[PDB]
Ligand SMILES: Nc1ncnc2c1ncn2[C@@H]1O[C@H](CSCC[C@H](N)C(=O)O)[C@@H](O)[C@H]1O
Ligand SMILES: Nc1ncnc2c1ncn2[C@@H]1O[C@H](CSCC[C@H](N)C(=O)O)[C@@H](O)[C@H]1O
Ligand SMILES: Cc1cc(O)c2c(c1)C(=O)c1cc(O)cc(O)c1C2=O
């Protein structure tokens with residue numbers, strides 16, 4: 001089995017989901033602080 | 038002249054502009070990836086960008102243009118514009134000798150063997166192709182060894198497109214060279230006459246150039262028949278073949294007929310999809326001044342219920358039947374879906390009450406007097422349910438137009454650089470036939486003098502738009 | 511022709527170059543603010559970008575080019591390039607009728623009808639010429655057919671050397687370009703590198719190097735169409751010159767060329783005044799071979815007060831330097847004999863022996879290689895052991911880099927692509943007019959070693975034009 005080159009879509013979604021992960025982190029931190037209060 | 042300090046506003050807009058480019062890149066790659074998934078499943082994908090992608094290309098080009106204006110040294114930038122015509126020539130030279138087609142025939146090709154198959158000398162031809170490579174056309178892969186790149190690839194097996202380059206680089210160039218002198222001479226300067234243009238000054242003739250292309254000339258006189266116009270450059274090595282009457286047609290006639298196919302498929306492809314043609318049922322469109330009918334070709338593939346008649350001058354209708362439609366849709370000629378008519382659109386429209394009269398890149402070839410007559414002869418044959426669609430640049434400016442959508446600030450409302458092609462063609466029409474590319478208000482007045490009202494402007498995935506016209510009734 | 515899918519690598523470099531564009535923006539605004547700080551307190555400020563600002567503009571221009579190559583629809587981009595010569599015409603027409611100067615006379619803008627009356631262009635046509643330029647960032651539209659200068663066209667106000675350069679590119683050079691395809695394919699013109707068989711001789715229909723055609727005295731009725739296929743300077747139809755004492759008129763192109771190289775020298779040749787250690791020479795003699803009117807002695811004289819100059823060119827060019835250019839831009843330098851002029855043909859032995867520096871700017875590129883090694887051999891025969899010959903020319907790089915020139919970062923073209931567009935435009939001007947050649951380092955080495963000279967250093971400067979420093983192989 002040989003390794004395959006990654007596609008344009010693989011790159012674009014890895015960017016999009018990383019950006020989703022990063023937006024979710026800010027929400028989670030905000031709501032941890034609301035929850036704690 | 039001394040250098041000036043830049044202002045706060047230069048910096049703030051340079052930032053705002055840079056952030057716009059950065060948002061556009063994220064949109065562009067997102068829509069490249071939706072394109073990839075749609076290309077794979079398989080329509081419109083293969084002819085033109087998505088709406089979201091088209092707005093991103095148009096906006097980022099507008100931002101590119103404004104970034105150059107804000108970061109450049111003014112004088113550097115003035116002298117770059119002043120000499121940038123040599124890149125038009127370099128491309129013309131490379132495209133004239135079918136260099137795209139040649140490199141696609143092979144890891145790259147040595148320039149010495151590129152010289153052999155073009156007739157251009159190898160040391161000089163290196164410098165034309167590294168000009169192009171430095172500007173993103175073609176690639177250099179080795180020591181004076183060259184290949185097609187992502188941009189030049191679109192010319193391989195593309196005679197309609199190659200013809201368009203050849204048209205812009207042959208007659209239009211000499212008309213352009215003599216266009217300053219024509220604008221200032223007190224006699225030619227004010228004129229809007231089709232026969233007193235920079236082009237006539239170049240050719241040493243008085244006849245409208247639609248008929249100069251159609252002259253039949255003998256071989257010993259032909260290569261310098263253009264006077265100050267050098268002529269198609271390839272004739273020196275590729276003499277034209279005499280026809281059955283012993284005369285040769287002039288190369289520019291076959292080029293122009295095919296050029297408007299090429300040009301129509303680049304900026305006129307949008308109109309095949311962002312107007313509801315399917316909703317007309319089985320309709321008949323009359324392509325007045327249709328040339329070879331390149332746009333009937335673009336529409337015929339997609340809406341099988343439409344029927345056509347192409348109206349133009351004998352020789353192009355002729356070239357359409359004997360070399361173009363045989364090889365581009367022989368089935369349309371067997372089914373009588375397309376009928377042809379040698380016709381001068383200065384005469385009453387021979388086909389009455391048709392669904393659509395299509396008139397594209399016909400009004401921009403004439404000043405206002407000629408346009409009002411052609412528009413009335415079309416309408417003299419329209420029924421009240423008939424629709425006239427003209428496909429032309431509806432020119433906006435850097436400060437916007439009430440009836441056209443403006444770009445975001447700080448960008449020019451007309452998207453600046455995105456419209457560079459419309460302005461290049463504006464000066465071609467001024468140089469060759471005293472034509473005019475028109476603003477919405479300038480279109481409105483010439484339609485009310487012909488007894489038509491502007492029903493809607495169709496903004497599409499092109500700088501070129503559609504004007505739909507009614508009868509004043 | 512169908513539209514192709516974009517590849518992973520296209521996306522990745524479009525991101526990479528966008529991030530380069532974004533970093534260059536932060537460098538540029540930082541250095542705009544340091545530049546501002548240099549302007550208020552007051553030098554080099556008024557002539558040159560700082561090193562940091564120049565590297566950001568060059569980088570950011572290179573990235574611009576590659577972003578356009580990556581985001582454009584290929585056929586759209588092919589036809590935009592194909593027609594981009596019309597923007598050259600628009601700028602030429604505008605500058606030839608001194609529209610920058612007319613708009614600076616008000617600046618709330620000027621109605622185009624009143625602009626039309628002062629240019630000779632018809633107002634509705636002149637509207638389309640100015641909106642072409644406005645969409646492309648030259649001039650501004652401020653109202654319905656009301657126009658004004660912008661930050662780019664402003665540098666043309668009261669700038670005759672720069673206007674002269676625009677005029678030179680749009681006059682003889684344009685028609686020479688038009689005939690350059692037919693010249694390249696004809697089997698007789700195609701291979702020659704002779705100064706007398708170019709597209710330009712074909713346009714004018716003459717058999718003389720172009721240097722002396724511009725120096726003719728023509729009869730008043732013969733001058734406007736004296737250019738044959740070349741239409742001539744457009745303004746002559748409206749501003750005829752009165753015959754002089756011999757009943758003849760000069761060709762406008764002579765003085766346009768003289769001032770154009772002053773203008774061009776101040777845009778692209780300004781770097782060489784500051785990125786070469788001239789002050790370390792002390793009180794030295796620079797001989798400006800082919801110095802033209804002496805535009806480069808003008809730039810150096812203001813800054814290094816201890817250098818002495820002699821400007822060498824053709825008689826008529828010298829006299830323009832002495833009668834109109836230097837009287838009006840540095841009269842003290844002549845009255846002190848700091849600058850001397852000398853009518854000289856650089857195909858002969860140079861009369862000046864043992865000078866410190868022989869400056870030769872934009873001369874080697876006007877001739878093919880045989881003439882060039884003759885011109886360098888002429889100087890060499892006259893150099894002292896401590897003498898330095900400085901060639902100021904484009905030292906051409908390529909999109910794939912050169913061992914002796916610094917390459918742009920990846921993913922950019924190694925020669926910074928768009929940043930070098932002017933150098934390539936002039937490369938084709940040299941082919942069309944003089945059969946000249948803009949040259950790579952390897953091609954310069956071959957003619958320097960044929961002339962008995964050695965290249966000691968390449969000077970990369972805040973310009974796409976550089977300096978080649980040569981001594982004799984001794
Ligand atoms: N008097 C006339 N009668 C008919 N057709 C004419 C004409 N004068 C010019 N034409 C045609 O008008 C066309 C203008 S170019 C437009 C071609 C076509 N509409 C397209 O977009 O592909 C040319 O093909 C030319 O042959
Ligand atoms: N045979 C010759 N002998 C001397 N100078 C010559 C010459 N033929 C051309 N020239 C000069 O060579 C110069 C080329 S343009 C360079 C001008 C100057 N070095 C500058 O950069 O401003 C022109 O000024 C022209 O007058
Ligand atoms: C010399 C010359 C004469 C013309 O009539 C045209 C052109 C050039 C031309 O380039 C052109 C381009 C185009 O997209 C549409 C046109 O109708 C045209 C033209 O009509």
Ligand SMILES: Cc1cc(O)c2c(c1)C(=O)c1cc(O)cc(O)c1C2=O
Pocket residue numbers: 678679682683686710720771774872873876936939943944
């Ligand atoms: C028609 C023509 C003839 C020339 O000899 C030159 C030019 C044009 C020209 O544009 C030019 C520009 C420049 O920056 C330096 C030059 O030596 C030049 C030229 O020498």
